[PDB]
C-alpha cells in the first residue's frame, strides 16, 4: 500500500 519497493 505504501512504497514497498525493495
Amino acid at each position, epitope marked *: *500500500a*505504501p*512504497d*514497498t*519497493r*525493495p
Partner: single-chain antibody
Amino acid sequence: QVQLQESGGGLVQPGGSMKLSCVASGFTFSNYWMNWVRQSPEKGLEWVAEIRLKSNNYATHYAESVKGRFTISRDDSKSSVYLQMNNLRAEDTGIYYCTGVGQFAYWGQGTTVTVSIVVTQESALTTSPGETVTLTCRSSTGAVTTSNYANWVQEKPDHLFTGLIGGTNNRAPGVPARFSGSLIGDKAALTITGAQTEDEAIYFCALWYSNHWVFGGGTKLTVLG
C-alpha cells in the same frame, strides 16, 4: 553512503512563502516515492507529504495540516524533491527533512524553517548494555497489522535520523542485526537484542493508514552502565 540534502529554509513571517529543495544521491531516486517530514520545537515528527513515481503520474498526498497550502514535486532528471509552502503559519515552524525508501530508510540532515489517529509509544525506557529491550507502537484505530507497514526510525544527536525497519519487520540495509521489528499483542514492536551504549536515542514509529502516515510521539531510550 546514500545522501539526501535539504536546503531553502530560514526565518520567515506569517503569511509568507518559501520553497524547500532536497537533492538525493546513491540510490535510483526515480524508482522511489519521496516524503517530507518535519520536526517541531515540541521534538515530535509529523509526516507532511508524499510524491509517487512518474508511472503514478506523480500522485501526491498531504497531511490535513498543510493541504491547500503546500505542494510537493520532484524532478527525476535532477534527483530532487521539493516542497512549496504557501501561507505559512507559526505552527509550520520546524526542521524539514526529505526521506524515503522502504519506507523511511534515508533522511537528510534537514533544513530549519522558523516562522515568527493517535499513535502511542512509551515516553521513555531505560536499559543497560547487553539487555533486550522492546519498544511498542499502538494505533488508536485498533490492532496494528502488516497493512500498517510499521516503520521504526532512530534519532541520534543532533537531528540525525536513520530508518531501521520498514514493512513491519524488514531491516534497512546496513542496519545492525540487534534490531528487529515485529507485531506483538496488536502493537508494532522494535526489539534491540543486546542493547549497546550507542543505542541511546529517540525511536519513532510510523504507521500507514491507506494513503497517509502517522508518526508516534517517540520513545527516549536511555542506555545506562
